Design a protein around this ligand. Structure first.
Ligand code: MG
Length: 84
DNA sequence: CCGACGACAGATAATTTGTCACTGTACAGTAGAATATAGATGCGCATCTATATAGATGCAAATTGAGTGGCCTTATTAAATGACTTCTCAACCAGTCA
């Protein structure tokens, strides 16, 4: 039960080093140095313009690592794809 | 004189509200979907039915042609016309005369 509950501290102050699958760390020095992206389902069922059920949209977000500002999105019924 | 209860004032923690520091936990591709059933509706194919017969037959008038049966004055003469039958159809010698 303890081994599931373990907390981790966090980056503290203006210094941040993003670890890659290559074992290299990217030193994030300034705005637009490292953007990040992945997808998820939203948790609301939407309806068509007639009020009948469609499906839960997919949300994509692009974030800048240095500022943590949300730099762009895509929201739609469409599937994760290199197009999205 | 002694004991008990109410008025008024004074001090106080419980209650509520606010602020502040530390923290467990979700973000991690994901439940609309699969699998039965009844119940109604529609298209297709078969399985009868009821009507509609024209051809064949039987029969009964309606002539229709072809039969058959029943009823009737007669004898002489004469003429006319048309017919039939019968009969007949020799040849030279002997006695006058101009
Ligand atoms: Mg992802």
């Amino acid at each position: 039960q303890k081994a599931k509950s373990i907390r981790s501290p966090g980056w503290r102050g203006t210094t941040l080093s993003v670890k890659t699958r290559e074992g290299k760390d990217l030193s994030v020095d300034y705005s637009n140095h490292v953007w990040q992206c992945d997808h998820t389902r939203v948790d609301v069922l939407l309806v068509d313009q007639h009020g009948e059920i469609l499906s839960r949209p997919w949300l994509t977000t692009v974030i800048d690592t240095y500022s943590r500002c949300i730099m762009g999105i895509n929201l739609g019924f469409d599937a994760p794809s290199s197009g999205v």
